């Protein structure tokens, strides 16, 4: 949770090879701005990304300073990482900033249930890929993006815990049922899109859709 000011830098830190800095801003879904390799110290920026304006460093060490604020700059900030065996990427802790002067959809509302009752959230996906995976994951109020569920392109459907995917490849619809909704289970979820399983893979979010479980 960090304030600044336009003209003003930020150094987002990173709790967790490859690195991959994502931007979270209200109402949109999140994106990656780019990733970087601590090994050959390379960085690779995404399409309009400006070079210069992001600088990355480190291998307690990984930062990543923003050089130039802006009101838009504001948002909050994850670092994230490939899992050792590819299941899943993982997120870093989360990082507020506030700077003062292929398609994934899921367009499913704010849901509102009863605790231990079952919710299923919608998701949609465009794709030319012939081959993809979606993952799942759980924004809590802390801001951690949590990793949940991963559907592929060519499982059958997944189950794991209370959660469930009920996998639609002709219609490319891969809705998330939540079983025994509890308190807890109150969150944002975002569903995932991604290509192959590799270091520079990247992931298309949608704009997550608001559980609130109720008494």
């Known amino acids: 949770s960090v304030i600044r000011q336009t003209g003003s830098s930020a150094e987002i830190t990173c709790d967790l090879?490859?690195i991959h800095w994502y931007l979270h801003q209200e109402g949109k879904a999140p994106q990656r701005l780019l990733y970087?390799?601590?090994?050959?110290?390379?960085?690779?920026?995404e399409s309009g990304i400006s070079p210069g304006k992001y600088d990355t460093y480190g291998s307690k060490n990984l930062r990543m300073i923003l050089r130039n604020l802006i009101e838009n700059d504001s948002g909050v900030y994850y670092c994230?990482?490939?899992?050792?065996?590819?299941?899943?990427?993982?997120f870093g802790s989360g990082t507020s900033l506030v700077v003062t002067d292929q398609k994934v959809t899921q367009a499913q509302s704010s849901v509102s249930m009863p605790v231990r009752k079952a919710v299923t959230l919608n998701c949609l996906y465009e794709?030319?890929?012939?081959?993809?995976?979606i993952f799942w994951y759980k924004r809590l109020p802390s801001k951690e993006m949590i990793f949940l569920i991963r559907?592929?392109?060519?499982?059958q459907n997944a189950k794991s815990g209370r959660y469930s995917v009920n996998f639609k490849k002709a219609a490319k619809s891969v809705a998330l049922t939540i079983s025994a909704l509890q308190l807890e289970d109150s969150a944002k979820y975002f569903c995932?899109?991604?290509?192959?399983?590799?270091?520079?893979?990247?992931?298309?979010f949608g704009k997550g859709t608001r559980v609130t479980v109720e008494p």
């Open positions: 559907q592929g392109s060519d499982e």
């Open positions: 090879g490859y």
């Open positions: 995932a899109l991604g290509e192959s399983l590799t270091r520079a893979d990247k992931l298309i």
């Open positions: 970087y390799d601590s090994y050959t110290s390379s960085v690779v920026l």
């Open positions: 994230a990482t490939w899992d050792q065996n590819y299941y899943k990427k993982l």
């Open positions: 794709t030319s890929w012939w081959s993809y995976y």
